[PDB]
């Protein structure tokens, strides 16, 4: 039939794509990076412990000044932290307590918040009335909202397998990104804010162009769902954490995998992934209550941050690169260094 | 507090007021019962919610107790990616229709509907997030049951069943079949109830079961249990 002919043609085209990908591979990153000086061992002490949340913390985002923090917890609260003096600047109550993501505007003016309510609320921190009020509620997703990132433009991902670029001034989706066959779990925004990447439970990560709304590339290789994703600081590499206890480093230019970071002693999935300021270290929060810190340019492990009493839910490194925040289901954030 | 500026002291005072407000809010939110309502298609949840867009929250008040009912029927997604958000609920209200003998799935007519609900019950009772949350098992539409059983033998669903084809004897068999799926017999307790469409004691049964769960939890965290 016509359908069968199209399916076999697509299979042949995928075979051609695979052959093209494997024809450009000469040496793994671990063979070119075999003569460099190893990092060794990295020790980080808990400089700050941020307490005040009365439930599991699911979201956390760093401000662009590397001082202010925002964190979202299931007790219906969005708290903004000084993170130097441990002071609380704002405490925002949510209409829906089932929050699973939050974002901080790069200008420090707005905060985004979403969850199982299918709605992305946007709050204005700097008003003349002295209170934080809902500037705009964005609706149109039919599945749970998993990630949101500011670009008056915000890009969100949902559990309905579609992403959406919005316009906060109007309130309607200016672009809709489709092509994922499973729930989209994580978003990552390039340092140039022109190409973003979303990973899905399809065990695939897609690279989308914001201006055209067209999927540039698709990366596969995981054997389970993708929970966290990030860019290399120069915006030319991936960092995906999946449920099969492996992290992976995909390359945009080569359209190919470079490194897999895994160890036998780890059997649980990765919940959060982040790099360091220079991209030499790769942090990764795990289900077994701790946060490993891998050497990213090589493949070896470097350190462990095991000062948490529950699953590490969210992770983040400052823009300056001085500190690392880490949230968990035990309701405490910890600033390391 | 000796090297702080005046604005630093004022900021610390503001933070302390924020903590006071957060503590009061969290104390007010810990005195209210949270029940997660599950079920299958056309099981009878519509009658259950009347007799007492993402998540559908429902408020209720009985005696001096407040209840928050979290209907999750309208959210079609991957369940294992958001079900742990409901870890810590007081109880799981699972509604099953007893009229699922001659009824079959529209997508697959060859598959029975009762087994389809048993699969969901097994998946949610044996889940790794609800190893200590009690289940209130409601069995709805017992008026259609007592008239369907006389013309359609129950043996169609259960080839291994052997007993009298009456209501009072088949109800016990179906209750035992549903209750046997619990592999944690010591941490979880199932409170089965047989209800009709026009019964007004469902909310009292829910109140009794949740008071029992509260008593057991208080005995557990005090060390006596």
């Amino acid at each position, epitope marked *: 039939s016509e359908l069968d002919q199209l399916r076999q043609e697509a299979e042949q085209l995928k075979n051609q794509i695979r052959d093209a990908r494997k024809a450009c591979a000469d040496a793994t990153l671990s063979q070119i990076t075999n003569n460099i000086d190893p990092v060794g061992r990295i020790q980080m002490r808990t400089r700050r412990t941020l307490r005040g949340h009365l439930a599991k913390i699911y979201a956390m985002h760093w401000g662009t000044d590397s001082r*202010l923090l925002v964190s979202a917890s299931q007790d219906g609260k969005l708290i903004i932290w000084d993170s130097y003096t441990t002071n609380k600047v704002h405490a925002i109550p949510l209409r829906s307590s089932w929050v699973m993501t939050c974002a901080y505007a790069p200008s420090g003016n707005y905060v985004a918040c979403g969850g199982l309510d299918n709605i992305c609320s946007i709050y204005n921190l700097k008003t003349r*009335e*002295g209170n934080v009020r809902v500037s705009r509620e964005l609706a149109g997703h039919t599945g749970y909202l998993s990630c949101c990132r500011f670009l008056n433009q915000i890009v969100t991902s949902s559990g309905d397998t579609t992403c959406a670029l919005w316009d906060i001034e109007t309130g309607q989706q200016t672009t809709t990104f489709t092509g994922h066959t499973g729930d989209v779990m994580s978003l990552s925004l390039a340092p140039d804010t022109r190409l973003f990447v979303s990973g899905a439970c399809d065990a695939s990560a897609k690279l989308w162009d914001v201006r055209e709304g067209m999927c540039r590339q698709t990366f596969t290789g995981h054997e389970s769902d993708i929970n966290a994703i990030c860019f290399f600081p120069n915006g030319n590499a991936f960092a995906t954490g999946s449920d099969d206890a492996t992290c992976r480093l995909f390359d945009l230019r080569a359209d190919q995998e470079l490194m897999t970071y895994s160890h036998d002693n780890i059997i649980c999935g990765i919940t959060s992934v982040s790099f360091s300021k220079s991209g030499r270290l790769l942090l990764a929060g795990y289900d077994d209550f701790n946060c490993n810190v891998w050497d990213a340019l090589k493949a070896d492990r470097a350190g462990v941050l095991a000062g948490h009493d529950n699953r590490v839910s969210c992770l983040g490194v400052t823009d300056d690169g001085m500190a690392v925040a880490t949230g968990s289901w035990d309701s405490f954030l910890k600033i390391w260094n | 507090g000796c090297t702080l*500026s*005046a604005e*630093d002291k*004022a900021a610390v005072e*503001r933070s302390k*007021m924020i903590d006071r407000n957060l503590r009061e809010d969290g104390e007010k939110a810990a005195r209210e019962v949270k029940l997660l309502l599950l079920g299958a298609g056309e099981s009878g949840k519509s009658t259950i919610v009347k007799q007492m867009t993402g998540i559908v929250e429902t408020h209720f008040t009985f005696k001096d107790l407040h209840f928050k009912m979290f209907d999750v029927g309208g959210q079609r997604s991957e369940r294992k990616k958001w079900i742990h958000c409901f870890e810590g609920v007081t109880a799981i209200i699972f509604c099953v229709a007893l009229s699922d003998y001659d009824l079959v799935l529209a997508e697959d007519e060859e598959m029975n509907r009762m087994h389809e609900s048993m699969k969901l019950f097994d998946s949610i009772c044996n889940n790794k997030w609800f190893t200590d949350t009690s289940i209130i098992l409601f069995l709805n539409k017992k008026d259609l049951f007592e008239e369907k059983i006389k013309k359609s033998p129950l043996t169609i669903c259960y080839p291994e069943y052997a007993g009298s084809n009456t209501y009072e004897e088949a109800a016990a068999y179906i209750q035992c079949q549903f209750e046997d799926l619990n592999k944690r017999k010591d941490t979880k307790e199932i409170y089965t109830h047989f209800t009709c469409a026009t019964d007004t004691k469902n909310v009292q049964f829910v109140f009794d079961a949740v008071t029992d769960v509260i008593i057991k939890n208080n005995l557990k965290d005090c060390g006596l249990f």
Partner: single-chain antibody, 228 residues
């Protein structure tokens, strides 16, 4: 946002009075409040301060024991009860809202004034008048007794502006940050104990008196000010 004041008028010496400020248009329960007067000598003088949750009250050393400041949140009011009004208490009392967290402007909005006629770091400011025709840049200088730069990096200097027939308004907070709605023509700079305010293009809306104030510690002291 609005603060409307009442309770003034002529009072015989030795008596007592009460000044009431009503807030309309903002979350009054989360704002600390100040009472700041101004004698006919054109010198602003901080009088009293009450915290956001009424958990902290400060007074100027001159008025302690005679002035009581108290806020009421449900009806959004601020009261100053004045007892034994001496002849040096003739002024025009202003009420100022103030908010303190990381990155805020603690003196943005001022009240409108209540006439009342009865029958420490020192701030030395440059001069009393700077006659400059519009079109050219104007520089004003201000000096303190000791350094205002704290160990945390902040220098607590505030530059205000009072137009003829109006209440003051915030121009610059912490010596370098420009207030909201203030054009970028004004800018502030300096270091240690010496501070300057420069206006690149003076226009007809910059005429008035300028004041430099410190917020390093209480009491808060205002500069004499320079007329433009």
């Amino acid at each position: 946002v609005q603060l409307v004041e009442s309770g003034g008028g002529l009072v015989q010496p030795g008596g007592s009075r009460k000044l009431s400020c009503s807030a309309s248009g903002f979350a009054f329960s989360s704002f600390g409040m100040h009472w700041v007067r101004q004698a006919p000598e054109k010198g602003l003088e901080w009088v009293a301060y009450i915290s956001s949750g009424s958990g902290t009250i400060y007074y100027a050393d001159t008025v302690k024991g005679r002035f009581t400041i108290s806020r009421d949140d449900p009806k959004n009011t601020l009261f100053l009860q004045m007892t034994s009004l001496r002849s040096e208490d003739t002024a025009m009392y202003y009420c100022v809202r103030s908010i303190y967290y990381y990155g805020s402007s603690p003196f943005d909005f001022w009240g409108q004034g209540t006439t009342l006629t009865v029958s420490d770091i020192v701030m030395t400011q440059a001069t009393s008048s700077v006659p400059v025709t519009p079109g050219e840049s104007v520089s004003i200088s201000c000096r303190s007794s000791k350094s205002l730069l704290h160990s945390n990096g902040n220098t607590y200097l505030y530059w205000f502006l009072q137009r003829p027939g109006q209440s003051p308004q915030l121009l610059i907070y912490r010596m370098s940050n420009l207030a909201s709605g203030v054009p970028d023509r004004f800018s502030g700079s300096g270091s240690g104990t010496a501070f300057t305010l420069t206006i690149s293009r003076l226009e007809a809306e910059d005429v008035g008196v300028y004041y430099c104030m410190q917020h390093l510690e209480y009491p808060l002291t205002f500069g004499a000010g320079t007329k433009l």
